[PDB]
Amino acid sequence: HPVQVIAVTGGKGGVGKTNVSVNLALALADLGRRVMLLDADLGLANVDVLLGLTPKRTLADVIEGRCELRDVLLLGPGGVRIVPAASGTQSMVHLSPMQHAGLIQAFSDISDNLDVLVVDTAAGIGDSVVSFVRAAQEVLLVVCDEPTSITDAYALIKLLNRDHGMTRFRVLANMAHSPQEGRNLFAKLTKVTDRFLDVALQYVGVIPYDESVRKAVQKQRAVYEAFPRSKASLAFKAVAQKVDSWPLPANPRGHLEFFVERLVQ
Amino acid sequence: MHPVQVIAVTGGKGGVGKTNVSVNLALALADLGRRVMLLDADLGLANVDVLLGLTPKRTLADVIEGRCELRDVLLLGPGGVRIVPAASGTQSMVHLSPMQHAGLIQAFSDISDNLDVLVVDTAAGIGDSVVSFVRAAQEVLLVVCDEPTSITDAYALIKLLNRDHGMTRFRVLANMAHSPQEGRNLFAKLTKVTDRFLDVALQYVGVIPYDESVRKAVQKQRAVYEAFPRSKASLAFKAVAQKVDSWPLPANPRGHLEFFVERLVQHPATGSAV
Amino acid sequence: LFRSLVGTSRAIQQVRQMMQQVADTDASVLILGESGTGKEVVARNLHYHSKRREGPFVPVNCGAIPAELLESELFGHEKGAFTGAITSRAGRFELANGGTLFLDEIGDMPLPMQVKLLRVLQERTFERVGSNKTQNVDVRIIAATHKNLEKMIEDGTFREDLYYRLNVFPIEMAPLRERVEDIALLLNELISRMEHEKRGSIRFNSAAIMSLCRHDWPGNVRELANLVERLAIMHPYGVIGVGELPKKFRHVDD
Amino acid sequence: LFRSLVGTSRAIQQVRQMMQQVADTDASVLILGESGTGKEVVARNLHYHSKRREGPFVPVNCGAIPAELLESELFGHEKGAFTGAITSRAGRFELANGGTLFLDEIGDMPLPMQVKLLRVLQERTFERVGSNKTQNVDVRIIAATHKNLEKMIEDGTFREDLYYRLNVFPIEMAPLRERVEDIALLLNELISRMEHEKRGSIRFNSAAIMSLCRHDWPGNVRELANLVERLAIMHPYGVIGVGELPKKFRHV
């Protein structure tokens, strides 16, 4: 009955957050879930770009009061409903906290036959990212095997734990050149978090470095749709299996979150 | 004396190489004999220190929280580049207000020992931290890669700066280009869009090639310019620094918040007053 | 998932008696105690043991919601009402109708919201933001705080009248440092809760239980429950010996 | 640094006369004109002909500084003043002491700031944000606006007393379209400066200049200068005809 909500994040730019959000959403749809994908990079939208879509309206039109969320939904590959964001619209480059809250609350109107909401967050760890991450039920950090990505992911985990008491994080290694590289990267991250924090990290697995992803970005088609048998796409199906076995939320927590009414039952 | 050149390295899209460019451009400029300062303006998610393998005793968090002054956090890096390090996840630094960004930019007036060298490494995105530092700088250097998302985000940043702030002149650097002709074609893709929709002046700086030596350098947490001095990427950074060093110096203050405004006035008592 | 608080300690029996004091009334409840003591378990237990058992249980954390957003969270709003009100929506009070509203960290509630909370307690009415049509609500308030409300009254940060309205038979939680003899029982309970919500499974051996009974736990219980979650992710369906604990919880020699 | 007022038109001739007429006084100047008409160039030329020529020239754009920052920018602040006030620092009034402060887009100044500006005009003193210590400065005010300040007084958005204090010596900048006979001269000036700063080089043939003179110039001069800079970046050292000038400059 509750809707699973996954915030795809990781702090560091360019580690594959949007590629992961897009292709995980597709892989979940392919597994048989009803999936919605919110582009929460609100003023620098990329989900539509990666799928080659040209929305007539976006969240800018909702935020500015010209239409409702249901008006902007797009029926994407495998029936993933896409909520498209804006690309440089003044209105969307700084939403107030009240506008964030109103937007997150507005999703309760389109929740009807929905199993999973995937939220693609912007780069960084500012208040907007953190509001979307906190509003979700699961936090999926995308990490690459470079010191800057490990440091930024750790900084995000530290902020969410220190300032908001969050303790459970899902870690996906992306662009690994071997499965052992993904495992070794998870080991590097857990070394730092074990040393300084008390948090629970689950290793979800790895998305391999794959030229098919680069080709798909150039084609502006999801690698999962355009190269369904590439290593990256097979890896997304495996990740989707892991994600689908996550426990569903039971109770509302006390703060701003998606679909609170359904959590109250 | 002379005005300080101030370059904001930006681009909107994440992972296009903004910090690698800021760091190695700063080192290359220092190699030419310039006194260089490098500000990590990714204020809550510092990466300059990470790329350089440094562990600063103090950061901008110490300034914001009133434990020391801005001068006290300057860190001597490779080639003598002086670094203003940012914070990583520190609660005081992850949601700075516009007034805090402005107070910080103003605080930089306490500095008079650099030439052509505030390199400002901006965060991903086009929010207020980015835009305030980009507007406070004298040159805007957009780092762009040959993917639809980087082109789209660079365009959106150019469009915001033009539409909302009247900015017309932008420098464009192609990074991770698999050949020089690919970077030139990339510049042309971007200008096809900006020519169609805007009235802006884009200047092509050139290309930093895709180079395995950058990936190795990032793993080692050393600047590619120092760790791999003869790789093609480091030679390209030397060339870009020479071009940057030939850019015209700022002449006059514009009327808004910008770095080192008291030196732009070009008057001894004004320059002495702050 | 209603279980009487587990444990044999004196402290927890006092807490159970405080709960019995208010369990058969429909009055507002106040839960005092250090952060992480277990107040939401108490509130949901009270909810189950009341006529409102089948109604909604709605939590709000005043310390986890910005001051400027709390009014809209609590009372809801109408679509035209303010810049971000893009839809009309019921707030937490309306969602709690016929049930219980768990108001946690009320020591962080701003004074205007304390005024409106008192209005709900006394008149059983409220208005959505951007509307002044009066609405009725039949909700039981269970409030909680870790702060010294009497010091807040003296600092001017908490209303005296609200204090006298809420502070009648406060449930006073005991910190874990006063309940060491309960830790083993607590661990079983936490595992059981984890299994019940399909979140994982583990079993401790006696050496690991002993090390955890030797650990300090300033974070109270929540800290214990966090470690149980963490171990169920480190070693899913595994047996937890001292070597399976994170190094800081190992107390073989101390 | 002083740019020259070029052109043969009667409007620019008058402006040049006025620079000399007001050279003997520190009277506040108010320059009215559409956006981009050259108001700061006039203000610098006025300063250069004033008794303050060797003092500083300090611009402030009340339209490009957020309302909450403008007081700190104008008056300075002490370190304890507001959350982001991490240093003590003189503001633009102090930086202009002995010289000229150019308040651009004065019609964007908030009303509380208008009261504080009026006080500094009258009493020639001010206080830093976060302080009550009195500061003396001797600054000559040149303000500029593209808005109808009198209707703003009627609407209650601008103060009448401040307006009368600023408008001692008024100057009206003609829009570019009322002085297209100047464009050739302006182009030579723009290009010349562009070359002397090594920012590029361009020439126009006579047909291109005719087409440009046929233009509406919503952005006045500023738009002309942006066009020069754009074509120079576009056709380095080129000769601009009519084909190189193709939408909205294209009239032939």
Ligand SMILES: Nc1ncnc2c1ncn2[C@@H]1O[C@H](COP(=O)(O)OP(=O)(O)OP(O)(O)=S)[C@@H](O)[C@H]1O
């Ligand atoms: N599995 C992969 N294999 C190969 N290349 C990949 C893979 N995943 C991502 N990439 C590359 O990484 C680039 C960046 O991916 P994005 O999804 O835009 O990352 P991001 O983390 O969302 O970046 P931003 O700008 O912070 S939103 C893509 O355009 C691809 O070039």
Ligand SMILES: Nc1ncnc2c1ncn2[C@@H]1O[C@H](COP(=O)(O)OP(=O)(O)OP(O)(O)=S)[C@@H](O)[C@H]1O
């Ligand atoms: N010239 C290059 N050749 C090869 N790899 C490069 C090159 N430039 C950048 N990279 C790679 O791109 C990664 C991202 O570089 P960054 O400098 O972190 O980009 P960034 O734009 O600052 O990303 P942010 O700040 O998180 S938005 C580096 O870690 C390298 O792996």
Ligand SMILES: [Mg+2]
């Ligand atoms: Mg993205």
Ligand SMILES: [Mg+2]
């Ligand atoms: Mg960076």
Ligand SMILES: [Mg+2]
């Ligand atoms: Mg100075």
Ligand SMILES: [Mg+2]
């Ligand atoms: Mg005062």
